[PDB]
């Protein structure tokens, strides 16, 4: 079911929990400028609709951690989330680790780089999980997304056209059941969102997936070269899910000219279940 | 060999022809604003280094044709290039047809949407073909190319990493031997450049390919949605060359929201040789 405008009240949603718990995770790498506003947008839900909120600090070297703490948030490093396992770089590692630092029956992810996010983001994402039937994953969409419109959607049309109806496959804002998340491998780096989406679909089909309009997104837009690497990992992850061998060769860029090669990973983390 | 700065004189290049001829093709769909300057940048070479110059008018409905004529250019419609074969849409069709409207041993393509192009573009592109050994294809590069850096190069790294060294795989400015071009199929739409590059490489290897710095490119930059479709066709063509089945499903876009689906083609034109 694709929603265009939520309506559930916070109280209705709370009633619908029926014993289920909700954890919220904000992954963060150097987001000192935006993190406070994001935390503040959600913390009023804590001890109510939300049972648990954490910042997964992914190696920040700015004031991200101290500002998050000063916002009353529990901050968890990659190392603290799962200390027995050495840390790998990239976003997917942080999200995967975050499963071990939470216990909610439902887990909600929100990027920490959002500019003044609506306080109803979380309620809007959990709606279908709480009041739906068979929904295990909820993606957000909103109203310029160069990677999404040039890379991910066109590749989905080519290789998983059934997912053509997903407006924001790379959305960093989404919610899912712990049962699902701990049953899926996690792709490395920026491949994580697309992997979760494709894996979910391949395993449960579209009926287990919803998407909700969160309105409009403001975010620290980004340099082309970093987008190159992101696109590369998205590709790697997507090709893998489609049974296609990726060279494992990183994107090289020429900035006469100088050359730089960005890392790409063909290694997923296994389902957090195997870590029990 | 990758050049960074040409030096050949026009006279040296002319001497090097040794009986070989040179045709120049400007494909054009609704470029009334830029076409004159492009024609004017090249016509001084005609009857000298360049034996032949044409505009391949690809269905323009603006003043492209009359302005090109007024610039002294021979204008050739898709229909006139090959009248026995009904016309298909897209850039690849125009370029393929252009082989039948030219007779140069060497063929040079230049996009008609360039803003005040250097008059040495053509000389710089033909340099390696004339003075090199074994070069059959010359690509340009220059100094924001969203499709190139987000789609084509990252996919090449994944699937033909040997072509990672190509700075502008989608460049509309390039030159090649008739022998090569008439021996290759032509991908439809915006897939044409990438197809020619991959096919050339697969068949003759890197040693037959050069790239030359033309400096900097100014061009009528472009709406995201049109870039989506372009990216989609590039993908289709690239997947095909890599032995990967494309769904044939067009990209859909949602502009509440309204939906539009863009065409994609999995059909190449065969080598112009078969039309003999």
């Amino acid at each position: 079911t694709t929603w265009h405008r939520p309506g559930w009240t916070i109280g209705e949603l709370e009633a619908a929990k029926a014993g289920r718990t909700i954890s919220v995770v904000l992954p963060a790498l150097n987001e000192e400028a935006t993190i406070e506003s994001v935390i503040d947008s959600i913390s009023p839900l804590v001890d109510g609709l939300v049972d648990e909120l954490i910042v997964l600090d992914s190696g920040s070297t700015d004031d991200t951690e101290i500002r998050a703490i000063a916002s009353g948030a529990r901050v968890v490093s990659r190392e603290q989330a799962l200390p027995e396992v050495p840390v790998r770089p990239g976003k997917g590692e942080a999200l995967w680790r975050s499963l071990a630092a939470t216990s909610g029956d439902i887990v909600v992810f929100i990027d920490s780089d959002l500019i003044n996010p609506h306080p109803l983001f979380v309620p809007w994402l959990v709606g279908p999980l709480l009041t739906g039937e068979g929904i295990q994953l909820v993606k957000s969409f909103y109203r310029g997304g160069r990677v999404t419109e040039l890379v991910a959607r066109p590749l989905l049309a080519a290789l998983r056209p059934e997912l053509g109806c997903v407006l924001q496959p790379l959305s960093g804002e989404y919610a899912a059941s712990r049962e699902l998340l701990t049953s899926l491998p996690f792709a490395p780096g920026y491949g994580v969102e697309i992997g979760l989406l494709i894996d979910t679909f391949d395993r449960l089909g579209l009926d287990a997936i919803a998407q909700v309009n969160l309105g409009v997104r403001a975010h620290r837009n980004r340099p082309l070269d970093e987008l190159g690497a992101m696109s590369r990992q998205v590709i790697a992850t997507l090709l893998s899910r489609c049974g296609i061998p990726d060279s494992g060769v990183g994107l090289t860029q020429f900035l006469d000219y100088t050359r730089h090669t960005w890392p790409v990973s063909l290694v997923d983390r296994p389902p957090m279940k195997v870590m029990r």
Side-chain angles (χ1 to χ4, degrees), chain A residues 1-4 6-11 13-132 134-142 144-219 221-225 227-254 257-275:
Chain A
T1 298
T2 298
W3 289 252
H4 280 93
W8 306 293
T9 70
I10 297 182
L13 295 171
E14 236 194 294
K17 285 173 63 174
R20 292 174 286 178
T21 53
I22 295 176
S23 297
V24 175
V25 172
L26 318 177
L29 174 59
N30 293 322
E31 306 289 353
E32 67 176 12
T34 43
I35 187 82
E36 287 166 303
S37 259
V38 179
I39 290 163
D40 296 344
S41 70
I42 301 160
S43 49
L45 300 168
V46 175
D47 294 327
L49 181 67
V50 176
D51 299 274
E52 171 176 60
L53 185 134
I54 70 169
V55 170
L56 210 122
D57 178 17
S58 306
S60 303
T61 51
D62 62 2
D63 283 341
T64 287
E65 171 175 340
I66 194 57
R67 295 185 179 185
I69 286 163
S71 284
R74 179 181 161 228
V75 174
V76 185
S77 68
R78 292 169 303 175
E79 297 76 2
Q80 295 172 315
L82 195 65
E84 58 266 30
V85 181
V87 172
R88 298 177 178 155
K91 186 187 184 173
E93 179 85 354
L95 299 184
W96 179 72
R97 287 181 179 264
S98 84
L99 303 177
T102 48
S103 54
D105 300 308
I106 287 170
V107 178
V108 191
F109 299 110
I110 305 284
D111 280 340
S112 60
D113 71 328
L114 297 179
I115 305 149
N116 299 288
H118 210 282
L120 290 174
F121 279 10
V122 166
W124 288 343
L125 290 169
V126 300
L129 293 167
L130 286 181
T131 69
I135 301 302
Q136 294 246 95
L137 171 65
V138 183
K139 298 291 292 165
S140 64
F141 64 99
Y142 30 62
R146 281 155 296 172
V147 178
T148 293
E149 296 299 343
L150 299 188
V151 184
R153 300 194 63 259
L155 278 164
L156 288 177
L159 295 174
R160 280 285 188 288
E162 303 92 339
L163 286 169
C165 56
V166 176
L167 277 62
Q168 297 294 335
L170 306 181
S171 191
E173 289 68 58
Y174 53 106
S177 69
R178 175 169 299 274
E179 176 55 28
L180 177 65
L181 297 173
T182 55
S183 288
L184 296 180
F186 272 49
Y190 295 118
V192 65
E193 278 81 36
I194 189 72
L196 286 175
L197 177 64
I198 296 169
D199 285 347
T200 294
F201 169 81
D202 287 349
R203 166 205 188 104
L204 300 177
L206 281 184
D207 291 349
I209 305 172
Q211 61 186 341
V212 178
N213 191 351
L214 295 194
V216 23
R217 216 201 126 111
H219 97 102
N221 282 68
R222 254 165 130 162
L224 194 60
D225 63 333
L227 293 187
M230 175 190 178
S231 170
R232 180 66 183 90
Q233 182 66 66
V234 165
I235 287 161
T237 297
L238 186 156
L239 294 176
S240 300
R241 297 311 190 266
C242 298
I244 297 156
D246 182 286
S247 75
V249 180
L251 176 63
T252 64
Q253 281 164 346
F254 299 81
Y257 285 77
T258 174
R259 79 182 282 167
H260 178 240
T261 306
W262 296 79
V264 65
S265 171
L266 306 175
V267 182
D268 294 335
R269 282 291 184 191
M272 181 57 73
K273 274 179 168 128
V274 314
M275 298 305 289

